[PDB]
Design a protein around this ligand. Structure first.
Ligand code: CLA
Ligand code: CLA
Ligand code: CLA
Ligand code: CLA
Ligand code: CLA
Ligand code: CLA
Ligand code: CLA
Ligand SMILES: CCCCCCCCCCCCCCCC(=O)OC[C@H](COP(=O)(O)OC[C@@H](O)CO)OC(=O)CCCCCCCCCCCCCCC
Ligand SMILES: CC(/C=C/C=C(C)/C=C/[C@@]12O[C@]1(C)C[C@@H](O)CC2(C)C)=C\C=C\C=C(C)\C=C\C=C(C)\C=C\[C@@]12O[C@]1(C)C[C@@H](O)CC2(C)C
Ligand SMILES: CC(/C=C/C=C(C)/C=C/[C@@]12O[C@]1(C)C[C@@H](O)CC2(C)C)=C\C=C\C=C(C)\C=C\C=C(C)\C=C\[C@@]12O[C@]1(C)C[C@@H](O)CC2(C)C
Ligand SMILES: CC1=C(C/C=C(\C)CCC[C@H](C)CCC[C@H](C)CCCC(C)C)C(=O)c2ccccc2C1=O
Ligand code: SF4
Lengths: 80, 169, 739, 160, 41, 168
């Protein structure tokens, strides 16, 4: 399964979570930004690696980073 | 609407107000997209060069210098007979003059950048004509008109020499 | 306040000309990177994203059509003007079989005047392969003054179409209901446009082209031929050549149409003097076409209680296997410009290819069959246009599926049922493509390896294992027997390609029976295989344009997008555009093979010279039958052999063809930089270049960015197509002009 | 002489090339009639070929064993009109182009909408800058001295 | 003629005019002094 | 309604009364989609050009300038004058005048106040008040239209039959 990391540059704009096609990211409470929220990656087993999450990231060099790793039938997007 | 004094069916052009040759002649509006100070500097320099060149024609066909090289009554053919060496010296001397008279600032963007430069005013007046300000404006207008007439005449003489080949006479 | 048009919808102003990108909501803010410049041209004609109203899109399309027709009219006017002023048309008229058509002279600069060839007739210029001279001769044009007047009329028509476009966008723009009158539009395009154009052309042929060309074939010089208007004012100048005009129009109105058999014939074959189709046959053909199309135009109900409703016809065509059938197709084709473009472009390209075939098969112009450069150029050009238009039709079908397809409005209809079993279609098409490719190409490779191993009896040749195209030979036999048996009123077969005698004009073969052997079997199956693979790519693009097992929401990404990401193992090129890109590549492959087959087969087994005793000697000598069955044969006896004229063209009047050969090679190789590389490398190189510019304080305000992934692919495919087609263009033209 | 080459005025193969080209042109000329424009064009071709060959012969041009002018670009002023003078001419013209482009970029870079003035050129300012490029060698060695030609550390750098 | 002159000031029109003028004077130099392999001086 | 010239056609709706030579003649409605000042300027330019052209054609078929080049009929004078460069000078000066005209018509269309065809050229007066100016404008328009039609007829007849000044 791929690896997804969140960095404290998160501004809690939720654009990553609402762009994930496989429900990998979610918004959790935080105290490091104005919005009081930070993205989390608790379901990386469903991560497919499409990187839509970091295409919607407005922070300078990203706050969500996807590191491709071992492959799985879920991560390979295999309907068969 | 005011309408121009020279071209009476055209609106009065802008940017020519405080000048010494203003008759409202700018149908193409060259003073709108080109600096008027640069335009007057260029007009004065072209006029002065044309006057000197017309006088040069008339003297060359008449007087000439001793020597085999300087023996062509036709100015156009004299440009070729004289060779490149005398002409290149004139080119370099004119360049030296251009550099020293404008004191470095020679380009359209560099000249008049700081202002304080009346267009065409090199301060050249050794004989003292122009101390009286009353006749100064008349002298400026006369210089402008003579320069324009000499531009037209310099073109005329050069093209007469090209279509006939002998001289001006 | 008309019910069809809106008056003064858009003001004629230059203000928006000074605001580039005003049409787009995203581009209107102004450029920030160089990507804006490329996006400006990529969205210029995408009227769907510029307005949210179908009416505005339709009006823009209508005015764009007017602009295109004005451009076409200007091009035709230029062609006629060049024929009038910079051509040897008058000299070619008096010697069609010995003067090469030229209509473009080259200025004497930088030594380029060598391009002015010895085309004959006391003329120097570039030989013309567009066949305009033959077309003008078939039109009865016998003077360059007529060409000048046609050019003037073309200029006037081009201005008229420009004015029409301006008028119908800015002064009186039609409403949506006017555009959606598909019944009225079909009625008019079928009766008025097609039928009345055929009728008017039949009238022109009968009254101008029939007498003038008959006099020309009789040997009358163009100067003593009467002016065309005299054939109308004087019923005696045409009644001598065709002694049936003496009865006037009475036989027509008295149903005694047999009297007009003098100039309305049904002969078939070719004119023995000119080598083209009998112009009496052509006039009769256009008359019949006019009547048929006028009749066909009275089909759809427009404004009276008479005719058909296309909605009622489609909705009644259901079936046990097709559910709701064609229900909803009328709404699809009356609310989506992209669906109409798909159908029209596909059928238009297919029509262009059919035209290309029927052109050389039955030469319709005088002295065009013996002008081999003209025939080769016309066939290749029309087949290329057809392939491009077919790929465009597939592209716009995919665009309709992505954008204008409504799932609710198409419940259980044909479109829905096709998407529901797209897997089966694509899998079986995949199997068919593999079967056809394996067989055709592996038979080619088997022939090559048997020849390389010294086993000549193991090939798939005529003197070996033979694959006779018996079905095509049966059809050829049926056509050569048609006159008198199935077409009893025919005097000759439709084309001598099916069989018959060798038709030669001035010792040059015009048409001749095209024998089909094992070599034609293999190349025909190659054609079928390439066409099937192109169809596979395009149909996979259209069907999987909305969703798939990989990306269940591919429609939300649009028609044109590079990917969905490196995930799922990699989701490159999943768009539908990336399928029109690959399909463009495969169309290039297929059309290149088709034109190669045509060129080699014609040069080897049709074209040539006929000896006075009747011995036929061809351009190459019949090497197609035995050497077109191996890839080494194609490489050596066709490519290497016929490329001799291109490479040896330097210093001659064909040197421009060698230069274009080299330049097209250069462009084709240039394409591979964009096709093989990726955007990240070029962006990071531009980073260092920008560093240098910033170091020298010359970095542009518009930030330079590498071309987008989709634009990189588009540039690559455009350069690839240009280079390959130009290389084949120069090769074909130099080879067929030299010999 | 230089590199084993010989002057084209004494190169037999050069004259053979001239004679062959003229003969081909005359043979082409034979197949046309009277003072017709094709014959005039071919005669002009012959005249231009002869003039070009004569000018190349009397041009201090060195010809090889193929009878074609070879360029001596080692730097010697003897053959200075082959490379050195065209080199100076191009350097002047290209420096002019680069200088006017850089000046325009830096001038509209200090306005409210720098990017707008790059797709829609300020033709007055563009004309003002373009005709000022004749002093580009002097302007360059007056801006480099003042430190206005080179940026120092405001330039961006990647992570490593 | 205020926005038309601004349209003529756009990058494509200006580049086309400048390149047409450039090719023009190059072609005319090569017409009046053809076959110039070296510097005329 | 019911324009003066064509009594059964409606008034062109752009020519009420406030133009010299306005009899309401625009059946095909050219004024409905083109500026009135532009059309007036074009008409007056045509009037003046054709008046000069008719007078010149008729006179040059009678009186010739000294020289062998000027010894041709006006019908064949175009190909001779263009070869001698005589028409080149006219083209140059007419182009200068027409560029100044480009400026003038642009200014007139964008405000200004210059009447169509009004170049203020009036060395003599010939027009002292508004009434005289209107009458002379009407005379100029009528004479110009007559001369345009007359030059049309002269050229067509001379081309049809290569006759001298009587082109019958
Ligand atoms: C739309 C199609 C088309 C095409 C491809 C051409 C192409 C050409 N025309 Mg042409 N022409 C066309 C339409 C076309 N014309 C029309 C509609 C007319 C009627 C007005 C003409 C009238 C015409 C004349 C009278 C001449 C040409 C010439 C030329 C050639 C040189 C053009 C040139 O250098 O101009 C450069 C243009 C510019 C720099 C303007 C920017 C070139 C092959 C010339 C030629 O062949 O010389 C021997 C020539 O003398 N054309
Ligand atoms: C008999 C009547 C008639 C005729 C001849 C045409 C002919 C044409 N139509 Mg058309 N049309 C008609 C009725 C007709 N239409 C009706 C009733 C409707 C309403 C449903 C439409 C709606 C329509 C649309 C929406 C479009 C066309 C287009 C076209 C053109 C197709 C391009 C082509 O084949 O090039 C052949 C070209 C020629 C043969 C050139 C000569 C044709 C000239 C222009 C005659 C045109 C006839 C015109 C209708 C007369 C009106 C004159 C006006 C003063 C009223 C062609 C010119 C398409 C096009 O190209 O747009 C411009 C297009 O997009 N038509
Ligand atoms: C009747 C024909 C027709 C029409 C009306 C359209 C219309 C359209 N197409 Mg389309 N298309 C067509 C044929 C047609 N196409 C064909 C035949 C193909 C197959 C190649 C395609 C493939 C295609 C794709 C793949 C796409 C479109 C798109 C579009 C839309 C936007 C077009 C645009 O902005 O381009 C503006 C015009 C340009 C950018 C011009 C580019 C220059 C070309 C590529 C090079 C031409 C070179 C030329 C031959 C000269 C080379 C000579 C050399 C020596 C210089 C528009 C609705 C796009 C879209 O989004 O649709 C909604 C899109 O993605 N089309
Ligand atoms: C010469 C190069 C080449 C070759 C051989 C192929 C071959 C093929 N392409 Mg293509 N393709 C090419 C270049 C080529 N392409 C390029 C440059 C592009 C870029 C645009 C594409 C883009 C492209 C697309 C987009 C598609 C194809 C498809 C296909 C397949 C069609 C089905 C078929 O015939 O399979 C049969 C295989 C052959 C004919 C190859 C030769 C096989 C020999 C003759 C017979 C078997 C030999 C035997 C097994 C050897 C065993 C011994 C060995 C173990 C030592 C086929 C594999 C389609 C596909 O997937 O297939 C349906 C498809 O959709 N291609
Ligand atoms: C834009 C650049 C440019 C420049 C600087 C010139 C410069 C010149 N041209 Mg010219 N010309 C140009 C473009 C240009 N031309 C173009 C694009 C065409 C159309 C293809 C022509 C067609 C042309 C003709 C037909 C003639 C000139 C002539 C001339 C010369 C006298 C005027 C002069 C050297 C004249 C000349 O010197 O010939 C004797 C002449 O007769 N030109
Ligand atoms: C990039 C390398 C390169 C170089 C160095 C040259 C250099 C040359 N080429 Mg050439 N050429 C090239 C690429 C190159 N070309 C390419 C890629 C092609 C294919 C399109 C050609 C096609 C070509 C042809 C067809 C011809 C040349 C000719 C020439 C020569 C005359 C140049 C000229 O007109 O000067 C005169 C013009 C100038 C000096 C312009 C500058 C003048 C300005 C206005 C001065 C103002 C400031 C003071 C020259 C030696 C011509 C020749 O005679 O060859 C010997 C010739 O006929 N070339
Ligand atoms: C539309 C205007 C026009 C044009 C195009 C021509 C053209 C021509 N005329 Mg002509 N002519 C004109 C008006 C015109 N004329 C008028 C109004 C008269 C009466 C005075 C004449 C009297 C005339 C004679 C007597 C002869 C010609 C001849 C000729 C031919 C060669 C010499 C020449 O240019 O004329 C030279 C013209 C003149 C000597 C008199 C012109 C007087 C002008 C038109 C009146 C003042 C108008 C003013 C200058 C406008 C300013 C223009 C503005 C842009 C600055 C040439 C075809 C000669 C020829 O070859 O005959 C076949 C010849 O012998 N013309
Ligand atoms: C060819 C077979 C054919 O077209 O028969 C026609 C067959 C009959 O379908 P329908 O009777 O339902 O069609 C009635 C209406 O839809 C008219 O189109 O269509 C199919 O079943 C499609 C299956 C294609 C299977 C490909 C093999
Ligand atoms: C005289 C002239 C202009 C004169 C104006 C003058 C003096 C007045 C100027 C001033 O009042 C103003 C305006 C304003 C004041 O503040 C300044 C002054 C100075 C007081 C232009 C001539 C302009 C002269 C021109 C344009 C001449 C063009 C000639 C051509 C084209 C000849 C071509 C041929 O000779 C060839 C080439 C080959 C031959 O075989 C064929 C032909 C055709 C004959
Ligand atoms: C055309 C021209 C002037 C045209 C003026 C016009 C139309 C004026 C019209 C007006 O005034 C009137 C009529 C009335 C006014 O109220 C209104 C306007 C409208 C203002 C000048 C040309 C002027 C032309 C000039 C000055 C040309 C000079 C050429 C020189 C010096 C050439 C030198 C060489 O040719 C040699 C000698 C040897 C070569 O081998 C090398 C070089 C170096 C190239
Ligand atoms: C080189 C290259 C670039 C860089 C290319 C750029 C930045 C294009 C630059 C184009 C210039 C700026 C304008 C065109 C200049 C040409 C001389 C004009 C065309 C020639 C005419 C005759 C048409 C990419 O961005 C890219 C992206 C994706 C895959 C491959 C590649 C790729 O290979
Ligand atoms: S960039 Fe190239 S590779 Fe990476 S995802 Fe987009 S398409 Fe697939």
């Amino acid at each position: 399964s791929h690896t997804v990391k969140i960095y404290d540059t998160c501004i809690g704009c939720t654009q990553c979570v609402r762009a994930c096609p496989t429900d990998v990211l979610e918004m959790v409470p935080w105290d490091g930004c104005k919005a009081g929220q930070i993205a989390s990656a608790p379901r990386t087993e469903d991560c497919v690696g499409c990187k839509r999450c970091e295409t919607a990231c407005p922070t300078d060099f990203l706050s969500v980073r996807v590191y491709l790793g071992g492959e799985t039938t879920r991560s390979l997007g295999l309907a068969y | 609407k005011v309408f121009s004094k020279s071209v009476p069916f055209l609106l009065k052009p802008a940017g020519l107000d405080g000048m010494v040759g203003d008759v409202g002649f700018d149908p193409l509006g060259f003073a709108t997209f080109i600096d008027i100070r640069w335009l007057r500097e260029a007009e004065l320099k072209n006029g002065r060069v044309a006057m000197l060149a017309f006088l040069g024609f008339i003297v060359q066909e008449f007087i000439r210098l001793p020597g085999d090289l300087y023996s062509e009554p036709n100015g156009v053919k004299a440009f070729f007979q004289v060779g490149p060496q005398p002409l290149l010296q004139i080119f370099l001397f004119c360049g030296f003059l251009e550099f020293n008279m404008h004191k470095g600032k020679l380009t359209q963007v560099d000249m008049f950048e700081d202002g304080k430069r009346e267009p065409g005013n090199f301060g050249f007046d050794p004989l003292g004509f122009g101390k009286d300000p009353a006749k100064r404006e008349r002298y400026a207008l006369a210089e402008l008109k003579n320069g324009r007439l000499a531009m037209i005449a310099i073109g005329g003489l050069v093209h007469h020499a090209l279509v006939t080949g002998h001289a001006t006479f | 306040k008309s019910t069809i048009v809106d008056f003064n919808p858009v003001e004629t102003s230059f203000e928006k000309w000074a605001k580039p990108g005003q049409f787009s909501r995203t581009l209107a803010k102004g450029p920030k990177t160089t990507t804006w410049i490329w996006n400006l041209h990529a969205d210029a004609h995408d009227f769907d994203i510029q307005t949210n109203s179908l009416q505005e899109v339709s009006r823009k399309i209508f005015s764009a059509h007017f602009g295109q027709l004005a451009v076409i009219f200007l091009w035709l006017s230029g062609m006629h003007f060049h024929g009038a002023y910079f051509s040897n048309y008058s000299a070619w008229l008096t010697n069609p079989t010995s003067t090469k058509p030229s209509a473009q002279i080259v200025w004497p600069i930088v030594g380029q005047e060598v391009l002015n060839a010895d085309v004959g007739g006391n003329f120097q210029g570039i030989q013309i392969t567009s066949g305009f001279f033959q077309l003008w001769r078939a039109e009865g044009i016998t003077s360059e003054v007529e060409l000048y007047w046609t050019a003037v009329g073309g200029l006037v028509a081009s201005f008229l179409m420009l004015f029409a476009g301006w008028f119908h966008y800015h002064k009186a723009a039609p409403k949506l209901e006017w555009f959606q009158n598909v019944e009225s539009m079909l009625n008019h395009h079928l009766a008025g446009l097609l039928g009345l154009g055929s009728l008017s052309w039949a009238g022109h042929q009968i009254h101008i082209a029939l007498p003038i060309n008959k006099l020309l074939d009789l040997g009358v010089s163009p100067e003593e031929i009467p002016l065309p208007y005299e054939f109308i004012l004087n019923r005696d100048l045409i009644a001598q050549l065709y002694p049936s005009f003496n009865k006037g129009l009475t036989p027509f109105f008295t149903l005694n149409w047999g009297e007009y058999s003098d100039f309305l014939t049904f002969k078939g074959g070719l004119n023995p003097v000119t080598g083209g189709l009998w112009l009496t046959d052509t006039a009769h053909h256009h008359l019949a076409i006019a009547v048929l199309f006028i009749v066909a135009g009275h089909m759809y109900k427009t404004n009276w209680f008479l005719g058909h409703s296309i909605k009622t016809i489609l909705e009644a065509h259901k079936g046990p296997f097709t559910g709701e059938g064609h229900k909803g197709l009328y709404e699809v084709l009356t609310t989506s410009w992209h669906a109409q473009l798909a159908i029209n472009l596909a059928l238009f390209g297919s029509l262009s290819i059919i035209v290309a075939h029927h052109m050389y098969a039955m030469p319709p112009y005088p002295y065009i069959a013996i002008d081999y450069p003209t025939q080769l150029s016309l066939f290749t050009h029309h087949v290329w246009i057809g392939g491009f238009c077919i790929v465009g039709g597939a592209a716009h079908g995919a665009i309709f599926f992505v954008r204008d397809y409504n799932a609710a409005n198409n419940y259980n209809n044909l479109i829905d049922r096709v998407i529901r079993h797209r897997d089966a279609i694509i899998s079986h098409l995949n199997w068919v493509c593999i079967f056809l490719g394996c067989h055709s190409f592996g038979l080619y490779v088997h022939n090559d390896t048997m020849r390389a191993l010294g086993r000549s009896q193991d090939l798939f040749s005529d003197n070996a294992i033979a694959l006779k195209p018996i079905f095509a030979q049966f059809i050829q036999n049926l056509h050569t027997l048609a006159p008198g048996s199935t077409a009893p009123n025919a005097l000759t077969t439709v084309s001598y390609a099916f069989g018959g005698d060798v038709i030669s004009v001035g010792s040059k073969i015009a048409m001749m029976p095209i024998s089909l052997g094992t070599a034609d079997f293999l190349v025909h199956h190659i054609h079928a295989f390439t066409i099937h693979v192109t169809v596979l790519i395009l149909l996979k693009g259209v069907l999987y344009s909305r969703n798939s097992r990989l990306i269940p929401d591919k429609a939300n990404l649009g028609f044109r997008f590079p990917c969905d990401g490196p995930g799922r193992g990699g989701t490159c090129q999943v768009s539908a555009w990336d399928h029109v890109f690959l399909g463009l590549f495969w169309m290039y492959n297929s059309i290149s093979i088709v034109i190669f087959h045509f060129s080699w087969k014609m040069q080897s087994d049709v074209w040539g010279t006929v000896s006075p005793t009747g011995a036929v000697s061809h351009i190459t000598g019949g090497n197609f039958a035995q050497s077109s069955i191996t890839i080494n044969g194609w490489l050596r006896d066709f490519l290497w052999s016929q490329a001799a004229q291109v490479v040896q063209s330097y210093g001659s009047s064909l040197s421009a063809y060698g230069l274009i050969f080299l330049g097209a090679h250069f462009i084709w190789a240039f394409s591979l930089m964009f096709l093989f590389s990726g955007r990240g490398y070029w962006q990071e190189l531009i980073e260092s270049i920008v560093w240098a510019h910033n170091k020298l304080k010359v970095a542009p305000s518009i930030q330079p960015r590498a071309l987008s992934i989709t634009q990189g692919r588009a540039v690559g495919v455009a350069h690839y197509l240009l280079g390959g087609i130009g290389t084949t263009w120069a090769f074909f033209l130099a080879r067929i002009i030299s010999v | 002489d230089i590199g084993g080459l010989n002057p084209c005025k004494d190169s037999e193969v050069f004259q053979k090339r001239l004679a062959k080209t003229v003969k081909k042109l005359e043979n082409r000329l034979k197949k046309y009639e009277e003072g017709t424009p094709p014959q005039i064009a071919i005669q002009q071709q012959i005249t231009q070929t002869k003039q070009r060959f004569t000018r190349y012969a009397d041009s201090n041009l060195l010809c090889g064993n193929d009878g074609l002018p070879h360029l001596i670009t080692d730097g010697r002023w003897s053959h200075g009109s082959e490379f050195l003078l065209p080199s100076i001419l191009f350097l002047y013209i290209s420096g002019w182009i680069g200088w006017v482009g850089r000046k325009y970029i830096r001038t509209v870079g200090q306005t409210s909408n720098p990017t707008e003035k790059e797709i829609i050129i300020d033709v007055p300012l563009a004309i003002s800058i373009m005709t000022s490029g004749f002093l580009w060698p002097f302007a360059a060695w007056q801006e480099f001295l003042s430190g206005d030609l080179i940026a120092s550390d405001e330039t961006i750098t990647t992570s490593p | 003629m205020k926005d038309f002159l601004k349209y003529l000031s756009t990058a494509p029109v200006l580049l086309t005019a400048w390149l047409t003028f450039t090719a023009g004077f190059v072609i005319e130099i090569n017409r009046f002094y053809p076959d110039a392999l070296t510097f005329p001086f | 309604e019911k324009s003066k010239a064509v009594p059964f056609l409606p008034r062109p709706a752009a020519l009420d009364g406030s133009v010299v030579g306005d009899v309401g003649f625009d059946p095909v409605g050219f004024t409905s989609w083109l500026p009135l000042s532009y059309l007036q300027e074009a008409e007056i330019k045509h009037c003046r050009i054709a008046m000069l052209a008719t007078l010149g054609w008729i006179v040059a078929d009678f009186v010739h300038l000294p020289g062998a080049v000027h010894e041709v009929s006006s019908l064949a004078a175009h190909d001779v004058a263009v070869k001698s460069g005589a028409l080149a000078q006219i083209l140059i000066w007419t182009s200068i005048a027409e560029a100044i005209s480009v400026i003038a018509i642009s200014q007139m269309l964008e405000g200004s106040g210059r009447q169509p065809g009004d170049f203020k050229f009036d060395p003599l007066n010939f027009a002292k008040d508004e009434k005289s100016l209107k009458k002379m404008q009407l005379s100029e328009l009528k004479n110009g239209r007559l001369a345009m039609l007359a030059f049309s007829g002269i050229v067509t007849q001379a081309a049809l039959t290569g006759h001298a000044f009587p082109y019958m």
